[PDB]
Design a protein around this ligand. Sequence first.
Ligand SMILES: *Cc1c(COP(=O)(O)O)cnc(C)c1O
Ligand SMILES: *Cc1c(COP(=O)(O)O)cnc(C)c1O
Lengths: 379, 379
Amino acid sequence: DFHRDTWAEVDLDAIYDNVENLRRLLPDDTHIMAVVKANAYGHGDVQVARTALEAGASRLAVAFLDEALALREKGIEAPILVLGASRPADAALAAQQRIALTVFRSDWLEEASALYSGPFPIHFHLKMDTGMGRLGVKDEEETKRIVALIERHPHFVLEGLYTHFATADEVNTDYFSYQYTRFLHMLEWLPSRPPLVHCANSAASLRFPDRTFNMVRFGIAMYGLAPSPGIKPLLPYPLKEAFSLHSRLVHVKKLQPGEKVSYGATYTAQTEEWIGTIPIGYADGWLRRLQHFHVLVDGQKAPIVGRICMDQCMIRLPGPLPVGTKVTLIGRQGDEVISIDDVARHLETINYEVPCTISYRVPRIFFRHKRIMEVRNAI
Amino acid sequence: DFHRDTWAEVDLDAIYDNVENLRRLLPDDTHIMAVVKANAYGHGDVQVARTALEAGASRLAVAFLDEALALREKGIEAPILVLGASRPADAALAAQQRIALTVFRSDWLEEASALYSGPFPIHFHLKMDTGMGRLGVKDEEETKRIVALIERHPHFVLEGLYTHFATADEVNTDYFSYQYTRFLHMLEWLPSRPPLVHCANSAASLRFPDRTFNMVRFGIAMYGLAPSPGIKPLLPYPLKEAFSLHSRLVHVKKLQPGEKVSYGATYTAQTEEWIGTIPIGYADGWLRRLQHFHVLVDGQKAPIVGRICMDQCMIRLPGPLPVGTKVTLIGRQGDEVISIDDVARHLETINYEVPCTISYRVPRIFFRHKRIMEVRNAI
Ligand SMILES: *Cc1c(COP(=O)(O)O)cnc(C)c1O
Ligand SMILES: *Cc1c(COP(=O)(O)O)cnc(C)c1O
């Protein structure tokens, strides 16, 4: 239940299709690892994880331990890999919750070894830095050492090893190739190929599906968003956008010329205008930078006038509309549509950041099989 | 507890002091309503509310119904006012939970009257628009109609009436004076005066404590943040900033000239540099626009290098530092300090928006009497 007329809608049918289409494109030996970090990119962790698994994914990935434990608590029983770092003293916790960990330092293992002695086995995924410069091992003696410590511990298992690309969404493939080639060279530092070798993100897997090894880490595209605009025309199938955001007019009034609106009085009515107030502001992730952006109301675009407030903002209406009238900030209304890509453009950022920013304050309504399936209200 | 080395700290002692000083500043007959909307501006709703009431506040204010219900659930018994809009159907729930509502339309009351009929009383606070252009009544007849509908319903009660300033934080008081005077004029439209008349936010009450009537709505300054830059030297007492944000190096490494860092490979090491990786990214509220900013490490400024990722970012270190070295994003490390205003400047926004954007993903550690009081991990 929610008591403010502002909410996001998440179409799980769209997410289902985005994953199934990829399942249809990959070799039947290749696993799809659904990346669901950051509450599924602001779409809802368990709701997306479930749908993805139903569509063909066999594993899930999160950013840090807390995100994995939360999925376990909500009943997800499929394998989960923590992509980022964790504390050596937390290995036992991840072990008994059947959570796989990313490893990239030999001193971490030495510490973990002194802290853990079974009985649950711990599955590690070795990260190799091939040119992203974030996480990962970079030299032979380190890789060999990490492997040695793993092989020597009765409850440490090297389940996989992977790398991440810095430029897989760029039309130019020069740095990509260097990373790919660097990866192939480093894989030779291992005495034997672990069961899971992975390297592809949304861009790499949809662009070069044959050179993705045995596991793909599917993220941004699962949500229906293109990794980048320069890669959109090169996409194998149409992506279906899943996120939409709506509100309703809670007040309508007519301003006389010379009348001002909001903080600092930076907006002045030049004529007799109709102004509508909506219950969404920057504490909801609708950042102040979005002043001047246009929202949809009654099938028409209306500009956000005056400064955006913490919980509210105003728009110049086409004419006098009734209170309760639906306002679409992201999504479709009749002939007009506003995409997350349109919002990112205005905020001078990339689509990834947008749904992530729509805060915990905004409830998520899920659709599946073309029917309302669940409402998630964080507070 | 939490299992990622990235956390925010809220000093409840600072908050206590900011409110206590206001209690001494205002005439003993003027009440303090602490504004804790947006999860207490990202500081923690119940933790701040409790401290504020301990320091001298007697009432609380939130943005919408869900926020007020959550406080009641967390054990808060103090009067709570919902500043924004709500549904007429929800009038009964608010009444049963002892939650005062803001009203500014007669058609809303028309609807709530037919849906509600006792036995609990609903206390209303009539909102008057005097120049902000957000919410509020603007003419005499509507004002009288509203009062009349409230008058004839046995369980509807007009507990207060108020307005809000658009420029109380601007050194120039031209518009402020206009609004203040307009409020006084509109007050005469009411047959009798409700027990509570309020108009002041943080800026208005810190600057003109004598023109605040009987209740003040203290927000931003409660958190130790100046309402505006220009109003800073005009502040009666020193504000104590309550919010700090920290992390730790999870990876340290040396790059060779020519190696690139992060997405797009936009950064190239020009010489042999030590790069540190910390576990915080834009999904944590540390927006991509903070790309050219810095963080504190070992009492020294370290610039972020390359693009910021969803859950991690890299920085150039002064040299080889041990993994686990504390990094401060907002706060003081020795002689250096990074305030929210500094971050706000680089993000090109106001200090208000910063703590609100630090997402649900980041745990809040509360300090009281210089001791850790609680840890709040939303996931
Ligand atoms: C977040 C993440 C992904 C997913 O990337 P997309 O660009 O959204 O496909 C893949 N791999 C790793 C290592 C990640 O951290
Ligand atoms: C948010 C809010 C406040 C608090 O304002 P500060 O600038 O944080 O003091 C006061 N009154 C209203 C109506 C508010 O919306």
